[PDB]
Write an enzyme that holds these catalytic residues in place. Sequence first.
Site, PDB file in Angstrom:
ATOM      1  N   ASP A  36       0.793  -1.232   0.000  1.00  0.00           N
ATOM      2  CA  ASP A  36       0.000   0.000   0.000  1.00  0.00           C
ATOM      3  C   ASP A  36       0.817   1.268   0.000  1.00  0.00           C
ATOM      4  O   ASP A  36       1.267   1.727   1.064  1.00  0.00           O
ATOM      5  CB  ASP A  36      -0.932  -0.013   1.228  1.00  0.00           C
ATOM      6  CG  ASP A  36      -1.972   1.081   1.236  1.00  0.00           C
ATOM      7  OD1 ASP A  36      -2.136   1.750   0.197  1.00  0.00           O
ATOM      8  OD2 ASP A  36      -2.538   1.339   2.298  1.00  0.00           O
ATOM      9  N   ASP A 220      -1.800   5.634  -5.357  1.00  0.00           N
ATOM     10  CA  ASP A 220      -2.137   4.681  -4.306  1.00  0.00           C
ATOM     11  C   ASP A 220      -2.407   3.271  -4.799  1.00  0.00           C
ATOM     12  O   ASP A 220      -3.518   2.980  -5.245  1.00  0.00           O
ATOM     13  CB  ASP A 220      -3.339   5.229  -3.500  1.00  0.00           C
ATOM     14  CG  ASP A 220      -3.760   4.422  -2.283  1.00  0.00           C
ATOM     15  OD1 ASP A 220      -3.053   3.433  -1.941  1.00  0.00           O
ATOM     16  OD2 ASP A 220      -4.748   4.808  -1.634  1.00  0.00           O
TER      17      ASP A 220
HETATM   18  C1  LIG Z   1      -5.396   1.865   3.980  1.00  0.00           C
HETATM   19  C2  LIG Z   1      -6.652   2.016   3.144  1.00  0.00           C
HETATM   20  C3  LIG Z   1      -7.101   3.469   3.120  1.00  0.00           C
HETATM   21  C4  LIG Z   1      -8.315   3.706   2.216  1.00  0.00           C
HETATM   22  C5  LIG Z   1      -8.113   3.172   0.802  1.00  0.00           C
HETATM   23  C6  LIG Z   1      -7.581   1.745   0.782  1.00  0.00           C
HETATM   24  N1  LIG Z   1      -6.448   1.493   1.752  1.00  0.00           N
HETATM   25  C7  LIG Z   1      -5.939   0.071   1.669  1.00  0.00           C
HETATM   26  C8  LIG Z   1      -6.939  -1.005   2.009  1.00  0.00           C
HETATM   27  C9  LIG Z   1      -7.118  -1.406   3.322  1.00  0.00           C
HETATM   28  C10 LIG Z   1      -8.042  -2.387   3.646  1.00  0.00           C
HETATM   29  C11 LIG Z   1      -8.806  -2.952   2.644  1.00  0.00           C
HETATM   30  C12 LIG Z   1      -8.634  -2.568   1.323  1.00  0.00           C
HETATM   31  C13 LIG Z   1      -7.693  -1.604   1.009  1.00  0.00           C
HETATM   32  C14 LIG Z   1      -8.581   5.203   2.149  1.00  0.00           C
HETATM   33  N2  LIG Z   1      -7.632   6.057   1.607  1.00  0.00           N
HETATM   34  C15 LIG Z   1      -7.850   7.498   1.518  1.00  0.00           C
HETATM   35  C16 LIG Z   1      -7.272   8.056   0.222  1.00  0.00           C
HETATM   36  C17 LIG Z   1      -7.489   9.572   0.128  1.00  0.00           C
HETATM   37  C18 LIG Z   1      -6.907  10.290   1.341  1.00  0.00           C
HETATM   38  C19 LIG Z   1      -7.473   9.715   2.633  1.00  0.00           C
HETATM   39  C20 LIG Z   1      -7.241   8.201   2.723  1.00  0.00           C
HETATM   40  N3  LIG Z   1      -9.741   5.572   2.608  1.00  0.00           N
HETATM   41  C21 LIG Z   1     -10.399   4.467   3.042  1.00  0.00           C
HETATM   42  O1  LIG Z   1     -11.507   4.497   3.565  1.00  0.00           O
HETATM   43  N4  LIG Z   1      -9.606   3.356   2.801  1.00  0.00           N
HETATM   44  C22 LIG Z   1     -10.072   2.064   3.150  1.00  0.00           C
HETATM   45  C23 LIG Z   1     -10.714   1.262   2.221  1.00  0.00           C
HETATM   46  C24 LIG Z   1     -11.183   0.016   2.586  1.00  0.00           C
HETATM   47  C25 LIG Z   1     -11.053  -0.433   3.892  1.00  0.00           C
HETATM   48  C26 LIG Z   1     -10.434   0.380   4.815  1.00  0.00           C
HETATM   49  F1  LIG Z   1     -10.316  -0.021   6.095  1.00  0.00           F
HETATM   50  C27 LIG Z   1      -9.955   1.623   4.456  1.00  0.00           C
END
Ligand SMILES: C[C@H]1C[C@]2(CCN1Cc1ccccc1)C(NC1CCCCC1)=NC(=O)N2c1cccc(F)c1
EC number: 3.4.23.46
Length: 369
Positions: A36, A220
């Site tokens: 990530d 990302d």
């Molecule tokens: C870390 C996380 C952060 C991420 C996007 C995916 N990754 C990776 C991921 C993690 C778990 C499952 C799938 C992908 C995010 N990113 C933003 C980009 C713009 C600026 C603010 C942050 N927002 C979220 O809600 N996310 C998210 C998505 C699914 C599950 C989760 F728990 C978190």
Amino acid sequence: GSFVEMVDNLRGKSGQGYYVEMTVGSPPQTLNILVDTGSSNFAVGAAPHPFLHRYYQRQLSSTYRDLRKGVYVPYTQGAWAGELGTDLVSIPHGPNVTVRANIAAITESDKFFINGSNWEGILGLAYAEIARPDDSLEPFFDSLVKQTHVPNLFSLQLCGSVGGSMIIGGIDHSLYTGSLWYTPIRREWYYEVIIVRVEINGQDLKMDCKEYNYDKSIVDSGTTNLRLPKKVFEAAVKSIKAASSTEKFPDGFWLGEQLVCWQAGTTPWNIFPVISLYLMGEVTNQSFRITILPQQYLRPVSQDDCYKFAISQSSTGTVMGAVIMEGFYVVFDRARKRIGFAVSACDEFRTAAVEGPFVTLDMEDCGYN
Ligand SMILES: C[C@H]1C[C@]2(CCN1Cc1ccccc1)C(NC1CCCCC1)=NC(=O)N2c1cccc(F)c1
């Protein structure tokens, strides 16, 4: 090539992210870890969970050191809580080194782990500024560069069951064709970049370029979609709809609320437009463009191939996710504060492209302050 043993070190499931094997502790405990570039913590599932096949057992690791501090990481779509510590870490199909890194042991989570993703943790490859609890918790890559002679660079080839390569410490020439084109990393927090122009089938979207990067544009690997700020998403959908008018789609398809399926091998890729994102170059008034095919922005979800429109709305800036990265070999040149794009080595009428140079004036005005 010299980086051959790092080729094909990534695996994954469509829309469920790309993971690398990482070996933690002593005796060794190997886990599948989400790669990530959109976060900065190294964190692993450390207790039973219905979606985890395995987890980190700190009591079995003699080299584990409890930092005696909790950590909580919330996002819009999910969150996790755990305990901070350090342990020995190696990437068996990565660099030939072992480092002592910060590790967050995930004890509880909400909507973080994905059922059937086959990964049990996350490797945050972005910078310390967005690390939790704060920027004093050194990210894994920073520890790697500080403790070893591994060069301050990594590159990703994400191939759209999926596979790919994470080359750590260098660039593998077998993973791309043509030239690598670089865009500056604007600020070291997320991998922040500047988009200066957008085209749909060669037609300029004609929005003020500040809108493309409001409030930021990031690269990302952990986000599936190409996420666009509301105003940009609306104009881009309006243009994509017009360019694909040979077939009619429900409004909800463009919003990701509806899927459209086609008989196996009959998807009319030719009816959908190509999308071009122009990025700020390394020389004054110079830019380059990356071109995305519908095979990238229409993601597969029997004798029917179901697709989701993988361009979505954002209120936290542009996110160039796996949709964008999958057409390219992407170089995260941390040492020189830049990100490189080249055509990935992974139809008959069109191909993903990285082209330049173009003359783009007042590109500095495209950034958010
Ligand atoms: C870390 C996380 C952060 C991420 C996007 C995916 N990754 C990776 C991921 C993690 C778990 C499952 C799938 C992908 C995010 N990113 C933003 C980009 C713009 C600026 C603010 C942050 N927002 C979220 O809600 N996310 C998210 C998505 C699914 C599950 C989760 F728990 C978190």
